[PDB]
Each structure stands twice: as C-alpha cells, then as structure tokens.
From a paper:
All polyhedra belong to the same I23 space group and the native crystals (at 100 K) mostly possess a unit cell of 102–103 Å (102.8 ± 0.4 Å). The exceptions were CPV4, which forms crystals with 2 distinct unit cell dimensions (101.7 and 104.8 Å – the structure of the larger unit cell is an outlier and is discussed below), and CPV17 which has larger cell dimensions (106.1 Å room temperature and 104.9 Å 100 K). Native crystals of CPV4 polyhedra grouped into two distinct unit cell dimensions, 101.7 (±0.27) Å and 104.8 (±0.18) Å, whilst all SeMet crystals had the larger size. Crystals with both unit cell dimensions were observed on each of several frozen meshes suggesting that this was not an artefact of sample preparation. In the larger-cell structure, residues 1–12, 75–108, 189–192 and 254 were not visible, however SDS–PAGE analysis of crystals showed only a single protein band, corresponding to the full length polyhedrin, suggesting that this is not due to cleavage. Residues 75–108 and 189–192 are clustered around the centre of the dodecameric assembly described above. In the absence of these trimer–trimer interactions the trimers of the dodecamer slide away from teach other, enlarging the unit cell. The volume of the central cavity increases from 7220 Å3 to 18,784 Å3, and the solvent plus disordered protein fraction of the crystal becomes 41% (compared to a solvent content of 19% in the smaller cell crystals). Since residues 75–108 form the base domain we wondered if polyhedra crystals could be formed without the base domain. The CPV4Δ structure was very similar to that of CPV4 with the larger unit cell.
Cypoviruses, members of the family Reoviridae, subfamily Spinareovirus, possess a single capsid layer with turrets and are commonly embedded in crystalline occlusion bodies called polyhedra, which are formed in the cell cytoplasm and mainly composed of a single virus-encoded protein, polyhedrin. To ensure the delivery of virus particles to the target intestinal cells, allowing the transmission of packages of infectious virus between hosts by oral-faecal routes, polyhedra are disrupted only when they are exposed to the very alkaline pH environment found in insect midguts. The fold of all the polyhedrins is highly similar – a β-barrel core sitting on a base domain, surrounded by a common array of five helices (H1–H5). The strongest intermolecular interactions define a trimer composed of a cluster of three β-barrels sandwiched by helices top and bottom.
Author numbering:
A (entry chain A), B (entry chain A), C (entry chain A): 13 to 74, 109 to 188, 193 to 253
C-alpha cells in the first residue's frame, strides 16, 4: 500500500545498480595530501578503462610542495581483481634500471589492500616519498574487451580528467560526499561512499 | 583533345577522393567563439579515430572568458552515423550524479544536427553555458576496427592537436578556407568546405 | 671453478635479456638540440607501444628557441621493421594539403636510417627547420597485438613521459650513460648504449 515508499526504494536501487550497466561511468579519484594541510584531487570519469601516470611535476602543490601520500578512490563496476596502484620512481619505473623494469612491479598494490567503502567503492592510502610518481589502472568488470566489442570500447572510452584544489580536508570531505565517491579521512575512517541509502546513516 | 583540362579534372577528383583511402587523414576542428569576438580553434588531424574531451580550463579565452559556443567541423571519410558531440557538465558528466551518467547522453548531437558542408564535411554549432565541457567522437568510415587490423589501427592512430588563436572571425574564415575545412560564419552561412572545385564557385 | 665470475656473467646476461620478456619496459627518448648548446629530452618508458606527436610549442626551448634537430633513441625489444620517425609540418601533416596527407609520409625515417647502438638500441639524428613537428612510433617486437591479448596490451600500456632539461651536452651524455640508452654525440659517435658489458669497454 505504500507505493511512495516502494518508488523511493526502487529509485535508491536504481542509483545503486545503474553503474553496472555496460555503458555506465566509473569514477577514480586520486587525492593528494600536502604538508600544508591542503589537498589536490585528480578526478577521472570514464566508461571502460583508466590508465593513469601522474608525474612528479603534476603531483607538486605548486619538498614541502610534494604530497605526503595519496588516497586512491575507485568507484563503479570496476574489476576488483585487476584494480591496482603502484608508486614508481621519478621516471615512472618500478626498478631503477629500466632494463629490469616491467609494466607493474612485483609488489603492486591490489587485493585486500584496497579497503571496501561500500559495494561500489574501494579506497587505499599510499604514502609517498619525494621521488615518487603514481600509476593507477582501473577496468570495467567483465566481455567488452572481447572480439568485435573491443573496437567500440576503444572508441567510446573518453576519459574526462579534472584537477581540483581544496584548502582543507573539510572541503575534500564535503566534495567526496556530494560526489558520491569513497574517501578515507585523516583518522582512517570511511567518511564517504558511492552507496545510496534510503534513510542515510539511520542506524 | 583537352588533356590539360582532363588532367586538371583528375587532380581535382584526386584531391576529393584521396581522403577515402584507408590511411588518409581526417580533420576535426572545434572553433570556440568568445564574447570578445575572438576565437580559439582546437584543430585535430588523425587517421583513424578521435576522442576529445575539452575541459572548462582549456575552453577559457585566458564568465566573459568562457565561450558562447563552438562550431564543430568534421572533415574526411568520417563515419557520419556515429559522429557525435555533446556538452557535458564541468566534470564531463551527462548526468549530475555520475552513478546515472553514461558514455553518451540520451540527447547526444548527431544525425541531421550535423549540417552538410560538402561531401567531405559536416559542421554543427553548439551553444555553451559557463558550466559546459565538450566531448567529440569521430571515427573513420568502415573494417579497420575488425580482427587483426585493429592492432595496426590502434598503433598508427597518432592524433596531432594544435590550438590556434584568432583575433577576429575574418582570420578564422580565411584559415578555414586555406585549410579546406567546413566552417559556419556568424550569419549561419557555410563559408568554407573541404570539397575542391575545378573552377571555384563559378555558378 | 669461478662461480663468482659465472654469476656475474649471468647477471650481465640477465640485464641484457630481461628487456625481451613480454611485460618488459621499453624506452624511447627524443633529445632536442638547441642553438644555445642546451638540450631538452622527451623521455618515454612504456611496455607495449609508443605513439608520439611533439608539437612546435613543446619543441621550443622556452627561431633560436627552436631545435636544430633531434636525436631519437629507441631502446628495448622494439619491432625494428616498424620503428619510425618523421618530421611533419606545424599541423602534424606530411602533405601541406591535409586531403592528401596520410598517417605516414612516403619518405618516413626507418630501416637502416636507424643506426645500431647495440643489440638493444638504435638511434637516429633528424635535422629540423623552424616549421617542423616530430612523430615517433615504436612497438614491442612480436603476438601481444593478436586476439584476446590485445585487450591486456591496451589496458596495460601506460606511457610514462618525462621532460628533462640539460645545460650542456656533457649532462646529456652522462644522463644517457647512467640511463642505459643510446645517444649520438655532436661528433657522430655512439657514446651510450643499452648493452651491459661485464668489463665495460676493455678492448
């Protein structure tokens, strides 16, 4: 008899399920934390796959200009068995001698290193030293990579990056909440998530 | 008996047909019109496919700094049934809530919204509001996306972008004419085209 | 009986062979030589393929600001029958009229124009005039482009570019030596290589 409630339930379910449709968007954000207490976010929206290399220059606030670390926030129907992050050297290498470097290092960040922030989101904190660059891979969960489809996947995958500066963690946090993306605050708490709740945190 | 004329005819036909060869170049230009009367062109040449995201910063003249709109000029052997443009928000999303956004919106600009500017060219005017970004997709008309070929298509597709500033529409127009690309002037007229004519506009 | 020597031999062989493993890194560097005697290097590390377009702006030192030419240094398990360089115009075209331009020009730089600098490295010097841009293609030697694999190749290919300024050729040379990449000095000599020697140049 409560169709108003049922409709609101389906709307909530729709929001939570819409990201699993084949042409849905995914969202990966790299939050960089600076000694000054400021943050910079590298915010990517994309439908199929995301390959990211952040060089040392882009990572500078613009070394107390260099981030103490990053929070990497993965959101959407992402293949969690392949999602990964690694901190490479200033050349983007995972071995100082390129001749023994590889696409990914033997200790790449993946698996349970990515903390669950809801069904749609995972987040990981990665400390950085002044000589680090950052690599991230995120792919849509299967298969759009197979056969004929790959061509449509390649041509339709327009990655839309934005860089956003925040004066304080409060701005970062409110941003994550209104953007519906995972974020871990300075105390280690999951303070934002992609998951829609019909009542919010009412328990 | 007029082989001089016949040769000139074949040269004209060669120019008009050369873009249909499998490794020919295509050219897509995004002309941004500013309140000041100045323009900025994002000029891309590419052989296989073009995926473009123009963020709000790139769109600024450098808000009366923000474009009133863009003319998107598509040129070459482009798949016209898939060529498309859309104006997304500042994040590159076609829904404010990313969880319900998709690679393309339900109202994407395509079909007869692209005005014929000759056999080789189509052009469309898209008005913009201060919070808009621009996405463009253009692919070569079929199949180089199929099977073994896809690899060569991926590896050979080097997109060559140039940004060009113009003080006035006259400079924009003369540029389009000498570049052989479609352009629509402020009065709505097609003033440039990719099509070569043996006598010019002699009728 | 000299296992210390044998171990060092295998280490040397390992260094020389490691680049031929399927997920090994490759390294392509474009060294730009300026009239001032300064250089700028565009240094790319990547595991599968590299498509590069350097526009006229990026080529400026920042016209005596424009390079006299570039040394292109290719390093790794690169498909040498497809490695190529070409100098295009300011639009990235190999014909002034785009309608008759192609992905590559009829005179592209390849084959024995690339000088052998060891088994792992080739290098070529390309003179430039003020109106030139630079294109480079390098692909991993086969097949990771075939069938199912192509998807992993596409998603794993994160190109990591760095731009590096050098005050003098000496800095360029020491860089190449410590980076283990091919470089040709001002006198035409191969002064750096990717090849590891157990004794260095002891002959």
């Amino acid at each position: 008899r409560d169709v108003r409630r049922e409709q609101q339930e389906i709307i909530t379910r729709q929001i939570n399920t819409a990201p699993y449709v084949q042409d849905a968007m995914m969202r990966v954000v790299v939050f960089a934390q600076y000694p000054s207490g400021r943050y910079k976010a590298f915010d990517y929206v994309f439908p199929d796959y995301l390959k990211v290399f952040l060089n040392w220059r882009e990572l500078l606030e613009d070394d107390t200009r260099y981030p103490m670390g990053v929070i990497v926030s993965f959101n959407g129907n992402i293949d969690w068995t392949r999602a990964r992050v690694e901190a490479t050297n200033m050349h983007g290498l995972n071995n100082t001698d390129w001749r023994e470097a590889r696409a990914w290092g033997p200790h790449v960040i993946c698996g349970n290193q990515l903390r669950k922030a809801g069904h749609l989101s995972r987040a990981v904190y990665v400390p950085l030293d002044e000589h680090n660059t950052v690599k991230v891979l995120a792919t849509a969960r299967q298969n759009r990579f197979n056969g004929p489809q790959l061509a449509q996947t390649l041509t339709n995958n327009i990655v839309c990056p934005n860089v956003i500066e925040f004066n304080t963690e409060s701005d970062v946090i409110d941003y994550a909440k209104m953007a519906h993306i995972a974020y871990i605050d300075q105390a280690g708490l999951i303070v934002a998530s992609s998951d829609a709740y019909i009542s919010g945190d009412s328990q």
